[PDB]
Amino acid sequence: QIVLSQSPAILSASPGEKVTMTCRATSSVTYMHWYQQKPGSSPKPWIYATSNLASGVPARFSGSGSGTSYSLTISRVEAADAATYYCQQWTSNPPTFGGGTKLEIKRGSSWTVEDLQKRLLALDPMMEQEIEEIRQKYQCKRQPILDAIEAK
Amino acid sequence: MQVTLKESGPGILQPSQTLSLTCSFSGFSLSTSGMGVSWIRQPSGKGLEWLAHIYWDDDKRYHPSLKSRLTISKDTSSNQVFLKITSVDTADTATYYCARSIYDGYYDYFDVWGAGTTVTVCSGSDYEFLKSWTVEDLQKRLLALDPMMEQEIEEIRQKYQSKRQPILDAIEAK
């Protein structure tokens, strides 16, 4: 019913460069919520009640908005931040999510070793997700033959 | 102390079948007013699509687009919440999370998320042809899938090694 619109759909930034992303809605929205999700894992509550940071969210993040103008602002982008951010509302049924902004690093393909290590780890959950979907492809592929055998 | 959620899925289904999901949780009860748990699903490489919800007072909410298919259930003593989806097709292949929302009347948001479960809708052709084959002929094709599967998996491994290599070379350099 209320449709959340996220722009930009994809955002490419440089480490240390302030950015801002927006979510706009058909109708007036009492509160805007934000969720971060790195590929392969569950989403994390990032910003709630339009401008409140969840436990463990870096101070470099910020939320702002009123009416149907809602925006997230990263003060100083860092490599760990690269993820898809979704906006969500519950002003009325049904609750709805935005398209999400995928945050990417300009230079993704010589920082501090901590940063390089962080990006190095982010890779593992994607690969597991991909591998698993290959297992269910063959779990699906396998099932017809089993049933035919299981007949008698 | 804190809240966890765990979703129990079936892995794979064929079309038209009733997909059923379990979500077990700890750290809160659905005997506490304001407590509620909703189902959200995410297609691979696509966005979040909220599904259903349920409250302490047994009050349900549904995606209007799919409500006829959906049904949401709860087990207050057992701390379980069930989502049943009927007559499934390819559009149901997704990763199904399970989340909590506290209803105060003001902000209603999802404060804790389970790990999620991944379901695949077997794109299902007529497979009556097999029933012509005997056991041993069927065993052959069954045996063929395992080497074929592990080759697509090592391909995903090699693909991510080539992604690791620029960062790895960045580490050893300095």
Residue numbers in the entry:
A (entry chain B): 1 to 30, 32 to 110, 117 to 159
B (entry chain A): 0 to 31, 31A, 31B, 32 to 82, 82A, 82B, 82C, 83 to 100, ...
Paper's wording?
HUTS-4 is a conformation-reporting antibody against β1 that preferentially binds to ligand-occupied β1 integrins. In order to maximize the stability of the complex as well as its conformational homogeneity, we utilized two antibodies in the Fv-clasp format; the affinity-enhancing TS2/16 and the conformation-stabilizing HUTS-4. The latter was included because it is known to bind inside the β1 hybrid domain in the open conformation and expected to prevent closure by acting like a wedge. Unexpectedly, HUTS-4 also lightly touches the PSI domain, which may have contributed to the resolution of this domain in the cryo-EM map by fixing the PSI-hybrid inter-domain angle. As the first step toward the reliable atomic model building, we fitted the crystal structures of each unit contained in the complex individually to the map. Models of the N-terminal half of the coiled-coil domain of tLM511 and a long helix located at the bottom of HUTS-4 Fv-clasp were omitted from the model due to the low quality of the corresponding cryo-EM map.
Integrins are one of the most important classes of receptors that mediate adhesion of cells to extracellular matrix (ECM) components, which is the hallmark of multicellular organisms. Laminins are heterotrimeric molecules consisting of α, β, and γ chains and are major component of basement membranes. Recognition of laminin by integrin receptors is central to the epithelial cell adhesion to basement membrane, but the structural background of this molecular interaction remained elusive.
